[PDB]
Each structure stands twice: as C-alpha cells, then as structure tokens.
From a paper:
Cryo-EM analysis of the cleaved S glycoprotein showed an intact trimer in both the neutral-pH (pH 7.2) and the low-pH (pH 5.6) buffer. The structure of the other ACE2-free state was determined at a resolution of 3.6 Å with C3 symmetry imposed. This ACE2-free state had all three CTD1s in the “down” position and was designated as the unbound-down conformation that is not accessible for receptor binding. Structural comparisons of the CTD1s from different ACE2-free conformational states showed that the “up” angles of the CTD1s were between 50° and 70°, while the angle for the CTD1s in the “down” position was approximately 22.7°. The S2’ cleavage site located in a surface pocket of the stem around Arg797 and covered by a “C”-shaped loop (residues 787–796) is inaccessible in both the unbound-down and the ACE2-bound SARS-CoV S glycoprotein structures. The “down” CTD1s are located immediately above the S2 subunits and have direct contact with helix linker 2 (left). The direct contact should stabilize the prefusion S2 subunit and prevent it from transitioning into the postfusion state.
The coronavirus S glycoprotein is synthesized as a precursor protein consisting of ~1,300 amino acids that is then cleaved into an amino (N)-terminal S1 subunit (~700 amino acids) and a carboxyl (C)-terminal S2 subunit (~600 amino acids). Among these, CTD1 is the receptor-binding domain, and one CTD1 in the trimer adopts an “up” conformation as a prerequisite for the binding of SARS-CoV to the cellular receptor angiotensin-converting enzyme 2 (ACE2).
Author numbering:
A (entry chain A): 50 to 239, 244 to 289
B (entry chain B): 964 to 1119
C (entry chain A): 723 to 811, 832 to 1059
D (entry chain C): 723 to 770
E (entry chain B): 290 to 660, 674 to 722
The structure:
Amino acid sequence: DTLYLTQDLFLPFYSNVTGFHTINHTFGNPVIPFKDGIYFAATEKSNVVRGWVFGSTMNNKSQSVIIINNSTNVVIRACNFELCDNPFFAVSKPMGTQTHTMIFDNAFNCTFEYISDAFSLDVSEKSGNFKHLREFVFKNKDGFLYVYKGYQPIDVVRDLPSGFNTLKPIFKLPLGINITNFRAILTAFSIWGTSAAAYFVGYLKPTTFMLKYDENGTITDAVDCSQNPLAELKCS
Amino acid sequence: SRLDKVEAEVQIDRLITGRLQSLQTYVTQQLIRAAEIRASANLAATKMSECVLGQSKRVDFCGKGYHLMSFPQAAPHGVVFLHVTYVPSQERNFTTAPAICHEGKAYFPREGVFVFNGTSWFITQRNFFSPQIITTDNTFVSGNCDVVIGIINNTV
Amino acid sequence: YICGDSTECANLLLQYGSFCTQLNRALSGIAAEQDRNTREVFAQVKQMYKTPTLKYFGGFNFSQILPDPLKPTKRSFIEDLLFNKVTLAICAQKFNGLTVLPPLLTDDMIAAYTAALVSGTATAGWTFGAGAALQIPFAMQMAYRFNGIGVTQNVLYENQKQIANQFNKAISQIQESLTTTSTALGKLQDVVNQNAQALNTLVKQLSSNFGAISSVLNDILSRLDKVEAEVQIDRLITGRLQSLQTYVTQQLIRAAEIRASANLAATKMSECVLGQSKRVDFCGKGYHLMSFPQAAPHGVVFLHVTYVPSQERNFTT
Amino acid sequence: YICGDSTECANLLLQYGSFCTQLNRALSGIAAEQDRNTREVFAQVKQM
Amino acid sequence: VKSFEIDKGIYQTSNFRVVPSGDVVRFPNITNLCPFGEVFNATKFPSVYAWERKKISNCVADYSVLYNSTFFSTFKCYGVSATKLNDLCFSNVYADSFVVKGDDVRQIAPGQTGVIADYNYKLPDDFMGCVLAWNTRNIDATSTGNYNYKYRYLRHGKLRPFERDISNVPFSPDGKPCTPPALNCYWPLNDYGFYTTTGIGYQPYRVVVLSFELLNAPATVCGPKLSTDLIKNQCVNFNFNGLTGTGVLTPSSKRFQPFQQFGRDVSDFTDSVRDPKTSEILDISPCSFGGVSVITPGTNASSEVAVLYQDVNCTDVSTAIHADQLTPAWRIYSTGNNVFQTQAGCLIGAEHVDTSYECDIPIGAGICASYIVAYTMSLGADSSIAYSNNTIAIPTNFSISITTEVMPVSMAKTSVDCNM
C-alpha cells in the first residue's frame, strides 16, 4: 500500500508495437536488433514460440546464447554457434515430435551451459482461443541477462489487448556477451507450417514509473512519467 | 602548537564550519524571537494607544472587566499595565416585560434593554441597577398592541 | 532519527556538541506554546454551564449546535461533520525516531468548552465575561444585539417568526453546504497537509545518501572496518543533522504563523462570541448580530450570525 | 544556481536528496501567500 | 538543568530505550566447503580476453585464507573492508580470473581505463568486492619467451561493465574483413612477454576479481557463524543473512510472495522479514523508546519525583525495570504504583484521584499532577442556571479590580564580533 518511484528500464506506455503476424503464407523470422533490452509477447496455441538466439553478428564468430526447450525442460547454452538462415523445429502435426533438432551444429570455445528444472509442456498443433500468452522481458543490465515471465488468458481476434499484466523475476545469467542483433525460433509443422498465431516486439527506455502496490503486495496500476504532463504531474 | 601545514587546514575548516553553523543557527533563532517580540511590541503599542490614551470598548482586550482606566508602568525589557476594570458582582431576580401596552399600542423602552416589570414599576439600565419612572420620555411610539410578550399599563 | 543506533556513531554525534539538546528544547517549547494556544482560545470560561436541554426559544432552535444526550457522543452534529471532513495523511511504535505527542486538552473536553460557550451565549445573559450571567431569555438578547447595529427594537418583536424561520433555514443551509461540498474548509486541511508533508519529507531525507557509500546505517556497518568508516558516518550525521535542523527551523516559523492565527482566534472569540464587536468586517461580513464557536480538528470554526440588508428604494431628503 | 550546468555535478546534487524540491515548494508557497496578501488587501469589492 | 533549586513543572530529560536481552542469528542450514582451494590455487589460468567466471554457491566461506598469508601481492578491496567480511551472507559469488603484466594492475579499479584495461576487461563502478593479485614469476615466466597467452589492443570502442569478447576479428577501420598483413589491416592480438630476469612491471601476475552479487536470492554463501533459535515478543539482537539490528519479533499477517526475502513498509523501513528456515515474521525493531520527563514538586516543599515514560504501554516498563533493562538505569528507584491511561504513557510514582483539581502540572492528555497525585482534570466550576422566562438578574453592587497585564516590548540588544 505505497507508491514507489523508481528509475529502471521499462516499456513505455502506449508506444509502438512491431507486430509479426505469421500465417502459412507469411514466414516471420527475421533478424532484429537488440538495442538495450526488448519486450516480447506471443498469442499461441500449445507453446510454439520456444527459442531466442541473442547474437552479435549472427554467425560462427559471434558468442551467442540460445534459450529453447527440448519439450521437457529449458536448455540454455552459450557458445560459438554456426547460425543458419533457417533453424527450424520439425514438429509433426499428428504427434509433435521434434525429430530434427538441428540447432547445435558445431561447438568450440564454449563458455556456458545451463539446464533448468523440467516441467510439463505441450508441443503439437491446436486451435481455438488464444489461451496461451507469454509476456517476457529480455533485459540487459551490468553485463547480466534478465528474463522475466507473466501469464494472462485472453480471447482476441488478432490484436494485442489492453490491460496491465505484472511480470515476475525468473532468470538471471552471468554471460556478458555483446548482444546487438537477435532472432526467435518457431516451429515448422508437418512443407513448413504454423497456425493463426503471432508474436510481438517492443523496445525499452530508461524513464521513471510510479507503481501502485495494493495492501496484498501486487501492482494494480503503474503510471509513466515521461508520457503526458498529467502523467508527470501524477508521478510528481 | 602541534600542527604544521595543510593537514591543519582540515582541522581549522572543521572548526570554522561547525562554529559558523552554530552562529548561523543563533542568528536565525534570534531573528524568529525578534519577530515574536515585535508582534508583542505591536500589541503593546496598540494597548497603550487604546487603553491608556482613551477607553477601548472592545471586550476582554484591555482588562477583564469593562475597562474604566489604564496606567502604564516601566519594566525590565517590557511594559506592565494596570487595567482599572469594572466587575459587577451581585445578583437579584426581577421580572420583565419586553414591551409596554398603555393605550392600545406597544412601547419599546430606549434600546437600552430591560423594562422593569417588577410588578410594572420602572425601566432600568443593562448593567447597574437604577430605576427610572416610566414616562413618554423613556419610551417611543411603536406600532399597535399586537406583538408583545409582557404587559404593562398606565404609562402616565 | 540521527544515527539509528549502534555504539560509536553515538560518540561521533556527541563530538558535535549539544545539538540534540537544542532541538529537544525547541520542540518542547513549540509543544508548550501550542498547549498555551489551546488554553488561550477555548479556556476563557471560568464558570462552565450546562446545556439547558430545551433548545427551542421563539423558534431559534439550537438543534445540531448544542449537543444531545440521546446520541452517544457529547458533541453536536455540525461538529461531527467538521470532524468527518478533515482527512489525515495501544501506542504507536515506529523507528523513524519521530512521534506525535497527544494534545493536553482532550477533544471531548474541547467539545465541552464549546458547548459551554454556546450554552452561555444562548442562555446566561449578555454580561458574559465581566461577571457570570444575567438569565436573559434570548429574545431580549437579540433585541439588545439589534442596538449595536443602528436599528430600533421594532425589528425583532415585529418579525419574531420571520427571523426565526430565516435563522433556522440559515442553519439548515449551513448543514447542506458543509456535507457534499468542497475546499471551503481549506485552512485546516492546509495545516494538516503541511505538517504531513514536512514529516514525510523528513522521513524521505532518511532514505537518501548525503555523499556516503550507502544511505543507511547497520548495512554499511557490515562492510566497514575503521576510521575510513568515520568519514562515511560523519557525512551521514552531517546531512541528517542539517535536514533535522531545517525541519526544526521551519516548524518554528509555522508555529509563529499558527500562534498569530491563534491570537486572532482568541481575539475573535473574546470580541464576537462574548459580546458584539462593532468593528466593521472583522467578525463576519454583515453587521454581526451573534457568533457561535464550534470545535474542529486542530482549529476552530465560527458561525457569524450577520445582518445583510438587501432591498433598495429611492427617497428624497 | 547550485551547480551551473554540466552533467555529473547534477549527479552529485541528486546525491543530497530532494533539497531542490523543498526549496521550490517553499518559494512557490511564498509566492502564493503574496498573491493571497494582494487579494486580501485590495479585493474587498464585489461590486466595482 | 544545572541548578540546586528546581522550580515546579514537567522538565524534559534524557531518552530511555530497552537494552536487548537475547541474541538471534539465523542462517540457512546449507553447510558446505568452498572451492577456494581450487579457484585461488589452480594450475591453468586463462588470458584476459577469455576471463573465466566461476559460479561459487551453496557454501560456507572462511574469509581467513585471504588474511593470514603474505603470499598475496595486492589485496585491495573496493566495496567492502577487510576484517568484517565474514559477517555477511552473499548469493552467487563470482570469481573473475585473468593474467596480466605488472603494469595493468594499476589500471584495475572503478574507472581509470587507460591502455589495456579498456579493450579487454571492463569493471563497473558500484558492484565491487575485492580485487586480488599475486606474483607468479616462478611458474609462468620463461626467460627464452612465453608466447602462449595473448590479449587485444585494437577494438572499435569501449566495453560495457562485465562484457567479454573472444572473437578474433580481422580489425579494420571500416568494417572490412581483411587479408592481413596488408596495409591498414592489422591483427588485434599481441603477446605478453613474461621473462625471468626482466623488470617488475613485466612479471606475470594472476589477478582474481571477486564480484560480490549482493543478495539477489535467499542467501547461500555464508561465513562460519552459529544459527541459534528465535525469541518472539522480546527485544533481541539480529544477524540474518544480510541484515542486523535490534528488534521485537512477532508472527505476521502477510501475503508474502515466494520469490522474495525482505518486507519493507510504506516509507522504506524493514518492518517484516522472512526466516531462512521457513518462517515469515514481522520486525517491530522499535523495542521501546521515548523520553522520560521528571514531574517534580519544586524542591522547596517536597523532594519526591515521578517519571513520565512517554511512548509505552506499562508492560515493557515493568518488565524492563524489574529485570533492569533501561538505559537511564537508576540506583534508588522502585515501582509500587503505576498509573496508566491517556496514552501519553507510563507514570511511575503517582496515584489516581477521583476529586479533580485545577490542573497544576500538565501531564500529556487530560491528566494533571499536583502536590504526588495524578488526577484527570477539573475543567472548571460546574454550574447550571435556571433558564425560565421574564425573571432577569441585574447586578446591584460592583467593585473595581485593578488586574495587572505584562507585555514584553524589546528583548536583549545583542551583537556578535564574527571575527572573534
């Protein structure tokens, strides 16, 4: 039950969204610049969007990290990675078995590997409402790598709904690599394929926010400072 | 005695900074006391120009009574008044009429209240008991005999 | 407040003289002056009267002004509205170091003083002050208050019912214009908000560094060893001492302003309430027929019964 | 007034807390009280 | 007040506080022995451009092998001090090792990048522990030439804090993957030159940077202390994982989130904690404080006093005096009676009186002392007047009452020679 002004790299309110609406005609997996921490979200059906390749020049001479799933557990390895023009998840349509996880091509001068706790995870193709919805923050600070997490069940036609969704501090990494450009990894159904699902990108900016904690200890409202003169009046 | 050079200037800067903060604290607090004491001085000049140089009818300002006189006296770093007041302390219980209906029309006394309807005898003052005989000089023509509470006759 | 507690920071505080004694003397003097303010304003009654429990005199009814025994509180209802209006911003136990001492004159005793003043205003004569009372039946009172105004006595007894209805509708419009309304109780809210902003600013100055490594004691006291630590603790003590001295000086200035307003309040309660003060635009806005004090959170609220004449003819002279 | 302008002196000023906010609140309060003084003295006329 | 004669009234005096009784230290039950005999004593050490970052966690560090030894050349700590290093519990301490000359240790600090310590190994300015370096001129140094370990000296720009590059890029001022040794296309690599009988600045040093990741979890790495039990509802001392102090502990009513360890309030104070062995207790660290204020009759009529403890509830006071806990600990002082109402606190040495008097001495809230007694207050002479109709009291006789009234006009005209 307080109000806590803090200066920290957040997502600004109301700002621009680089939406990637992939369909069976549109294969959305380009290279994206990192630029001091990003936002991420994905309206999905049974967890397609495992995979993030945070690189420098996206080739063999670039120390990069990979955050994927082997359908059982989160696997994080950072080493020199021969990054191809399309690494893909060969997810079958009747079953969903990644037979050809072909990502770790070669490995030399390796410096890191981490395997987290295993948990239940769905792979194969589904349809219906946009029940699965990740919201991640891939933040860079003091050489570390910060990865947060939060969930919200939605049912939207094709856009990003409006509403607050608090995130929670899962991961911290000791890596320290020159993350300038990156990509994501999707699943190629089986000829590739996805369902009517999309994933989003937002950029961070160092400005001041006023977080309104409740009596139970949960954010119910946040107010940016650098948005509106009424907003800086609120956080002043 | 036991210092030589610039290491001494650290010590002397500490002492100067501390004594300067203490002296500045003293100057600020004396300035606030001077503001309070000039508010009291303006009260004193006001009381000596109201009470002493005349008779100030404002209530419970000069003395406690009704302020008959006032006498200033000197004092060390101040002034002491002697408010000659007027405290009336006895009480009777007399009855009243808020009007007089003599001939068929009401009479209010002198604006200057308490008609003395102590069995319809006199008209007195507000403060000191002083009966005066009811005549037409002590009253005035007022309307008709329709808005009264008490009744007095035979105003002669 | 300064120097949270360990052992040795206390020695570094004692090496700045007797500033803690100065600040305690200044704040205790401020507390005593505010006790004197509440004694000066309210406690002008030697002879405390009782509420007459009749409360209807020619139609001049003092409902919601004099308290009622049928209700559990000994206030009145307008006092309840004024107590409900001013928001705030066992024994409390917080380790700021700060506190709020309780006032001397209790709130129910303040309401008893105000009920005594209103009851001795309505009952108990006009000679109230220099003496005790006169037992004047309150129509004779406002017949007398119609003589420090330049009108005759023909106004009141010929318009008894009209002035009674106007007075009761005026009290009822006060009851309307206090409840669902807004900023026109703003001086007391400004007092409470300025005190809360000063104290929260002091707590906020606890949060900040003043040039040391970290902004809190007992957490620097882990990773420090010796005299290099005394530099950091001297920086923190000097900064917190300047902030506390700033607080004491600004509270002393606010105390000077609030005792000027307290002397105005005591003057108005000894002019307006205890008589009829003919000086123009001091008590009310009209010609000041009566006056009624009411209690308030950290203040006082008057009700100046004035006399506003509003019609005009055009006669020759 | 304090800390003319560069970049880093501003950080050294922010390491003294919120004194600039205190002084701005105090001087704006003084300005508002002087506006109130001029309204109290002169503006006693409703009907000009 | 520096006098023998003392006039009648509440006078302010010193401040009381309950001295803590117990001593509560709470570390987690993880007990393990650190790899400090391996990370500080190893055979293979990398170069600067591939500095190794070892996760050291779930251990109990000793912090005594770093001190009782002259083997270390430069032991300079930055964020912490030396002797009180084993008083804290850290979380995921990281050891950063690399091998330089005798000159680059001068460039290892927050700031002072210079020549080699900018392109190769960048330090932050806040999150620092201790930087340790020792001489190893008898292992790595060969007089005929040790061309094994390299660094970089040509990179487009600086580094962010804790950032590392291994990538052997064919350096060129315009991108341009070159074919060296062509003109304006040099290599970034270079050898060290560790020799035996060379200068001191050309001798091999092993630099180990102990980053102290301060408490981003329930703590794992600790020092050799002894975790004791808890003592609730009694003023004790503290040593938690990263927190000390002095407090009165009690079970909470919190809704504390599982990723979380500390519980600060609306205005930045601790007020609640989480025990390292599955408990979530509040922290009312104000055991008791306030200020005593001696009620005295005036030293010319009586000499029996009464102490007013201001912010208490007369349970910590009686327990504190009968167990001798207070900081103004007297010698001739006992407690037979204890008046407590009107929350301005304990009043030792007084008696309730129903017959209210004219409030000689103003205790706190309503209550007033005299003589010693402590009644509430007589607000005035109680009265009730016959308020019927037309009967009216007129004063008949009077008096003249010359009452004094004192006004100050001018305080002491002072001046200060502000050069003396």
